[model samples]
Target: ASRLLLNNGAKMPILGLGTWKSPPGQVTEAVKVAIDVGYRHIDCAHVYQNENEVGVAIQEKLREQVVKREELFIVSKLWCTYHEKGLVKGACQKTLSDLKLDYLDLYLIHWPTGFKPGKEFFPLDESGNVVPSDTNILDTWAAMEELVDEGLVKAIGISNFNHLQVEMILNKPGLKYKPAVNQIECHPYLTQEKLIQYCQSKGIVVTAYSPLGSPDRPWAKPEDPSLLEDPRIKAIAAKHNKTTAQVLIRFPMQRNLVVIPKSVTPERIAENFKVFDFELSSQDMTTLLSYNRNWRVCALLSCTSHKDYPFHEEF
Candidate 1:
């Protein structure tokens, strides 16, 4: 339940529940279990397609007086399809409606790229490639700033943005607000030291998504290396008498970054929150740091052809 202060002076919980890939059938129960276990931060996205269920859980909790809207640091992202300036508010409104909330604690641009805006989440052609939109990132950012001004969002930031893209936003003319956080994929395999350092030095708190390496990722290959099963991480876990998942989730928190490990199971959700009780040794931290292979599990390959693709850079 530790918290970090954002550049904009808002405090955010360092550990959170990730809602991505959590099926609609179970997300409500997952969220309710998270709340029962003292989880105050919940990371959500419009593209996740389960916001309504999440809203149900949140509303139930609120109605029971378990937690208030002010006590929860709820976050949602703007999907690529709504990156156009004029469409941003409408997109945010839709999310607010789905989540059954008056405002968002934090709203993020889900990715740097834009897709053709409409009913389709992923517009495709006959060849089955994504149809790209021509909206500039600056235009999207400007509209995001307006969300804060209009009281629809308390804080605004970006996700999956490389260091250079973050710099562009910082250098934007008449920038209304410096990005408070940059959520990205981080685990032992993809340590992301440089990107974390760059963002931290610039006052952007880093939030690590898939901190457990996303074993259930849709595109996962059988042969892909698993962070949880790694010998070194296992050794560390054994040394601490903790599960590999606890060790993996703690790795990012030790580095002073936020971590969101998704799970629909009640026990795993509670287990992931047990990280605050123990600290990883300095040697264990260094060992994990040295295990970086720069491997990315959530690489948005479907939109690789887009000009705003973030992984092309060395960061």
Candidate 2:
């Protein structure tokens, strides 16, 4: 498998399996299937609430000597609530304990914003109303830095953060470590050129989530656009006798960015993993890059209403 060298000197697979929104009961099986089918990297988070099941599969693989723990690259995120200075280390340690891993290859601040502990999901109250919080992002990032010092995480990064938030963290005092990555909702619709360029300029790797535009997302808006049906993507996929999802994955990998597309279905998982087998033509790559519409699957506007919201502008 191809690897991207992180700023912290760690090597990460160019392609990884995303476990967001994967049902708890099925994730263990998904992990097992993914490993059996040639996936060596996985993207996970505590908020997903299925790490235990995923851990079981990973442990099984290790026990059977299917792969060594050192050979696999596992990435997870620290949720918003754990951003508090006193809570960050404990939260990451808790994740390690839950996943039954000694340490994460890469750990990210899940979101640039913060929320009260035990919240089911951001912006949702019991009545389904949006409730905002007042937490400062830099304070939370400070705690993230402490995690590296404590040896709980191998590398630290930010997710769902824009250019300004990234700059703020990069400029903080005693920031001995530069952010190794910034994971964002990216695909053809939301190419994120400016943000990607900015991160690259700072030597930060960018990981693209929702790479296929999440056409089947459970909570997706009915009016939400779909990348899978986009004529341009379809055309490229057709040209190569591949699925639109394969084109989406190949597009980003060619540009040297990491991509994580979620899947539990056996066929889809196998299809998504077949990307490395084919390469897109230069002309096709140019055509796909022209399809950027700036679409975002996970917008921050809903989360920014909180008192401590890190972003100043509305999404």
Candidate 3:
């Protein structure tokens, strides 16, 4: 597997297996299959609600000596409800316990935004009303730094954070470890040029989720464009004699961004893992970059009545 060096001198695989929407019943099998097929890096999150199953597969792999504990790169996230300073550590510990791992290769705050504990997916309650909380992200970040101090995580980072959020954390005092990576939704439609540049400038690795535009995503919008059908992407796929998904995955990996394209099927899993075998040319890179339409498949605007929806931009 190709590796990207984190600021802490740890190497993270350029391509990782994402378990985001890998439903409860199938996640364990999917993870096991992925591991058996040579995927050394895996991405997980508390909100995904499938860590237990993923943990089962991890333990099996370790017991069988398929891969040493030190050989795999594991990443997980802290949910919004865990943003409170008092709750952050416990939440991380819960993830560690659920995943049956001593520590995470990287742990990230799932989002810069925060909400009250036990609230539904939306920021509103059952009465269909909005109730905002006072949980600030920096407070949670301080606790994340402490996770490193206690050795619960090898490195810490952020996800779905904007440039300002990255700047705020980078500017914090006594930050023993800077965010090693910023995981976000990136694909042809949403290239995230400025934000990617900002993170790289700060020495933060950028990981691209939904790299294939998440065509099979359960919550995907009906009217949203399919990245696989995008003319430019299809043309590139034809040029490379690869599937559009492979082309999409290759595009980001070539640019040095970590990409996790989820798959449960054996053939698809193997195909996704074949990204390191090919490279995109400079002209093709520019052409693919031109496909940026500022499109976002996952918009959390309805999660809150907050005016500053991260996905909305004036341009």
Candidate 4:
């Protein structure tokens, strides 16, 4: 199963396929291909706007007797605009309806930073800056806990949250359910060791998004260093007789962090699933550590000024 046990005794697969930028037409077959290649976990979000297509693929897989709903780990996120009190359930229900699922294996608050609760993903000011929300994040988190009671979701968690924000939730006075997982952008360039260690100390698990460095992300700049081409990573791949992508995917898995590398190419999708046959040695692991530059390939800079914006502090 390559499944890790959560604090609540739930099992989550260590490797999955991400659907962050997967388009409508391509994502259906992408998901179908992922499931066909033995992938049981599919990371999704309302903001991705392609869950319906993803649902179609899942429906086909189930109808073909490839896998049961109970055997699949389906994760979806509540967008930032849905953080208003009492809006959490509706957001998840919309995703559930779109995905044609009865319940979610995991649901996360997409980001600590909340926007105005409305249709516009980002309500901007006249000056062209993103407007921030006034909603108390604790209130939003309380509402998320209710989804568990209503049986709409199995576990609640957060994404893109830094250590202070996580601690704020952890130390809240009437906290009902502590977050089970923290999904963040991580790779060799930004290993986030300190934050990962802090979360591990609290019995919470961490998941690495953009594990292959998200070279295809829309916001990528020409000057950006493509992680897959890094000489340090290439050297390690050469020594192990593996591709650089394999090393990148296996790095987080070896550290006990779940990784969801996104790719629509059929060969790449199947190649990513081939990581289990090899393991990086401890000496090479230490060598990989030296490549850290605290760089983030997917920093959402538009909301950097929001009070709840998480990347301000040193993690």
lDDT of each: 0.93, 0.83, 0.85, 0.91
Better of 2 and 3 by lDDT: 3
How do the residues 1-315 of candidate 3 rate in per-residue lDDT, one tens digit apiece?
489999999999998999888888888888888999899999999888899989999999999999999989999998877778888888888999999999999999987777777645435665765444577767888989999999999999998888877777878887668999999999888998888888898899999999988888777767859988888688888988989889999988877899999987778998888777787899999998998988887767555354323454321
In model 1, what lDDT does residue 310 have? 96
Please report how far candidate 1 places residue 145 from its true position, in Å: 0.5
Q: Model 4 over residues 155-175: C-alpha lDDT tens digits? A: 999998889889999999988
Task: Sort by lDDT, best first.
Answer: 1, 4, 3, 2
lDDT of 1 at 151: 97
Model 1 global lDDT (CA atoms, 0 to 1): 0.93
| lDDT assessment of candidate 2 | 0.83
Model 1's TM-score against the true structure: 0.98
lDDT of 1 by residue, 1-315 (tens): 499998777799998999999999999999999999999999999999999999999999999999988889999999999999999999999999999999999999999999998889988975799998999789999999999999999999999999999999999989989889899999988999899999999999999999988988887885969998998789899999999999999989989999999999999999988999999989889989999998999899998889999999998
User: Alpha-carbon error at 247 in model 1, in Å?
Assistant: 0.6
- TM per candidate: 0.98, 0.93, 0.95, 0.98
What would you estimate as the lDDT of candidate 4? Answer: 0.91
